[PDB]
Design a protein around this ligand. Structure first.
Ligand code: WUR
Length: 765
């Protein structure tokens, strides 16, 4: 029965607009298959369209904003694009229609409305770009009746092993189509929809912009060769209208020019299903997906006081939809240094210079191919899987659709190599690589990242203990399906635990260091003089200089998170021997957090190193790192140390700002220095952990119940209100928030863990 829910999940999730790196396109969860993408741009001159055309996501002065207003990957949703440069408000509606054997059908409506500033007679070029990879697959544009292009719909008929037979239609659409009275119209037509059907080697089909432009350039070269010149030039929009040439190929460019507002549909009909998809179907499924979305939101994300108002519902729906709507399917090779150069062991003083040398051997090579199905932090700046981000992303996604979340967990865990490593940053294929400088592509088998995916697993387990609708919860409603999922995953969880202990081990035994356990001590590999990228907190201050004797309290706390999870999951599976090992490890981490990291003088946890004199020294920098045993859920509710942590947390002169907790204390010497990334700003993911733990202390008998109740109340309010005020003013979720001014800063469109705000509002953890 487990493989039955599995098959249904596969069929459910196969199609989506799973190309979040571009404004709008679709792809199935298959490496080498059919992909679509949208392009549009005003044209006012002979040279402007190369500058105005839109395709890959960005964020700059010329784009007011864009994002999903509703989305569910099983059903589809609606996206809104507000484009200032091109004077256009665009809506892209996407809907899926189950049926047949190949993952069903789908349809999209693209609607453009000029805004108030645009010339009422703007010419906008619109391209629908279609490609198909596969040796034994075919795709053909049925030619038109008319001489120079299409008066009606463009039908592409295709076939592959993965999709069977299918037709993809681009409807004629509604809006004024400009007409040219130039002589050229005797050879190119007066103006109409055109199709060019092309073939290029499979591996470059993703390069839609250059492919389109090479065709535009050939058209213009043709003008020049044939005596169309500046004495009497055709209008720009006709100079940039491709000559119609439909056929078979692995690339099909469908181009329309509109004057004023426009709209058109794309209808993908899987042959193996009922009759084909119509526009009437598209409109009905769109209306239906909205109603379903509406009803699930109010059940799953029931906003509590004081955020019950409609302004907050709208806010929550926006933050949620952007998060779950950034889900992508990525496919290809990634770049990995598999030398395991000994310099990566970081065993000597000055290790960062040795590691630099090894990186300068450039032994890295492409490997795979791999696939990943994942949500991402940032459509415009970094639209790809990040390992510890994904644990935060899936917390609200799991509320929505636990089965989808498990799908994504599985996807990540299928990347893990034989040692237990998953690369923290998943740049899969040439398309992904295109948006990343070559110096930053290389992954390193010694670099960890927080295991925040265990958090999602913990939520799943509590739920397991305590048709699209049915599927979304099938793995908790069918407990046998649940445990079977854990059974297959568990060995990989254990592999990653062991990997952490073998690769990120700190050194107790070799210094004058005393502690309850000889074993439990951890140090993030990969640190530079000013950074510790693998920890997730890039530039939070760490012992200076970095040192093989360093110990990092956040890392030990992450290991504590892992054992606690393995206890739970081991128990469910009766891995009795495993469970007793985990038990001794937990107990040991509990003692060693105190013996190695607790500072009585400072009243918080600290990283540690070793002295010029070879002695253990705590290095205290009050901020997120200091609270880690608390944030990761490792302290007993009655703990005196917890009490001191709550005092530091609430202290306005240290961490507590009107806008959330500061990443670093105002009192720290590194406050607001250098790039100031994690050295003062408020970050939603860590604030979210704080909120969850305050709520935990707050809803149990103990000495800190009422303190935590008050802190919980206020921090929930501060964090929610700050992210809401910024969203109201700017339309954006931001990467972090300024603790002096409350302003969002760094990167926009960070959905992204900022969207945790939906779970914070809906409460009852
Ligand atoms: C190559 C690159 N080009 C970039 C361009 C712009 C940019 N900005 C404004 C305007 C224009 N351009 C910005 C950044 C750019 N990058 C770096 C990519 C990695 C950043 C990771 C963010 N984040 C850092 C967190 O500390 C970490 O915890 C977390 O896991 C991670 C993933 O969310």
């Amino acid at each position: 029965l487990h493989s039955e829910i599995g098959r249904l999940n596969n069929q459910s999730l196969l199609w989506g607009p799973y190309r979040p790196n571009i404004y709008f396109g679709t792809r199935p969860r298959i490496g080498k298959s059919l992909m679509t993408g949208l392009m549009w741009g005003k044209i006012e001159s002979y040279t402007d369209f190369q500058h105005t055309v839109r395709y890959t996501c960005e964020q700059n002065e010329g784009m007011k904003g864009y994002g999903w207003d509703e989305y569910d990957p099983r059903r589809g949703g609606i996206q809104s694009i507000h484009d200032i440069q091109n004077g256009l408000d665009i809506t892209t509606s996407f809907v899926k229609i189950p049926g047949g054997a190949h993952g069903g059908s789908w349809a999209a409506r693209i609607k453009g409305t000029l805004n108030d500033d645009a010339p009422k007679d703007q010419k906008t070029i619109v391209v629908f770009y279609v490609s198909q990879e596969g040796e034994n697959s075919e795709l053909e544009a049925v030619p038109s009746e008319n001489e120079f292009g299409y008066e009606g719909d463009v039908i592409l008929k295709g076939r592959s092993e993965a999709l069977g037979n299918y037709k993809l239609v681009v409807t004629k659409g509604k809006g004024v189509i400009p007409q040219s009275d130039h002589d050229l119209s005797r050879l190119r037509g007066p103006g109409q929809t055109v199709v060019q059907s092309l073939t290029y080697p499979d591996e470059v089909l993703w390069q839609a912009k250059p492919i389109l432009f090479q065709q535009l350039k050939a058209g213009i070269d043709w003008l020049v060769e044939n005596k169309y010149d500046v004495a009497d030039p055709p209008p720009p929009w006709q100079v940039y209208l491709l000559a119609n040439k439909p056929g078979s190929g692995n690339v099909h460019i469908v181009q329309k020019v509109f004057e004023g507002d426009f709209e058109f549909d794309i209808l993908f009909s899987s042959e193996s299903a009922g009759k084909e998809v119509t526009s009437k179907d598209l409109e009905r499924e769109v209306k239906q997906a909205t109603e379903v979305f509406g009803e699930r939101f109010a059940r799953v994300f029931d906003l509590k006081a004081p955020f019950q108002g409609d302004n907050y519902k709208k806010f929550g729906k926006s933050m949620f939809s952007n998060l779950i709507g950034g889900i992508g399917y990525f496919y290809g090779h990634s770049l990995v240094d598999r030398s395991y150069a000994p310099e990566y062991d970081e065993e000597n003083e000055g290790f960062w210079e040795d590691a630099a040398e090894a990186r300068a051997r450039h032994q890295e090579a492409l490997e795979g191919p791999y696939e990943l199905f994942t949500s991402i932090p940032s459509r415009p700046f970094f639209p790809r899987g990040f390992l510890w981000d994904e644990g935060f992303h899936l917390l609200p996604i799991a509320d929505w659709d636990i089965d989808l979340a498990l799908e994504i967990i599985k996807s990540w865990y299928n990347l893990m190599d034989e040692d237990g490593w998953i690369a923290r940053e998943q740049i899969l294929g040439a398309e992904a690589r295109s948006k990343v400088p070559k110096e930053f592509q290389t992954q390193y088998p010694h670099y960890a990242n927080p295991p925040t995916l265990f958090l999602v697993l913990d939520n799943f387990v509590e739920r397991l203990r305590k048709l699209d609708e049915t599927l979304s919860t099938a793995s908790v409603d069918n407990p046998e399906v649940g445990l079977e999922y854990l059974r297959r995953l568990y060995p990989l969880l254990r592999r990653q635990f062991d990997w952490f202990r073998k690769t990120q081990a700190g050194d107790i035994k070799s210094y004058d260091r005393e502690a309850y356990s000889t074993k439990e001590a951890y140090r993030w590999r990969g640190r530079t003089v000013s950074h510790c990228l693998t920890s997730g907190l890039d530039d939070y201050p760490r012992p200076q200089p970095p040192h093989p004797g360093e110990l990092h309290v956040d890392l030990m706390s992450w290991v504590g998170v892992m054992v606690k999870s393995l206890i739970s999951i081991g128990s469910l599976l009766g891995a009795t021997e495993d469970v007793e090992f985990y038990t001794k490890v937990l107990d040991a981490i509990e003692h060693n957090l105190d013996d190695l990291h607790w500072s009585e003088k400072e009243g918080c946890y600290c990283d540690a190193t070793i002295d010029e004199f070879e002695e253990h020294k705590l290095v205290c920098h009050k901020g997120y790192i200091s609270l880690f045993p608390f944030l990761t859920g490792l302290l007993k509710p009655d703990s005196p140390k917890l009490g001191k942590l709550l005092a530091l947390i609430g202290d306005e002169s240290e961490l507590w700002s009107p806008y959330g907790l500061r990443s670093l204390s105002k009192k720290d010497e590194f406050y607001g220095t250098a790039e100031n990334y994690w050295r003062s700003p408020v970050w939603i993911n860590i604030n979210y952990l704080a909120i969850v733990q305050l709520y935990n202390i707050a809803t149990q008998d103990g000495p800190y119940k009422e303190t935590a109740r008050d802190l919980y109340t206020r921090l929930r309010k501060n964090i929610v209100e700050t992210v809401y005020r910024n969203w109201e003013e700017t339309g954006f979720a931001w990467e972090q928030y300024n603790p002096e001014t409350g302003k969002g800063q760094r990167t926009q469109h960070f959905t992204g863990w900022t969207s945790l705000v939906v779970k914070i509002m809906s409460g009852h953890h």
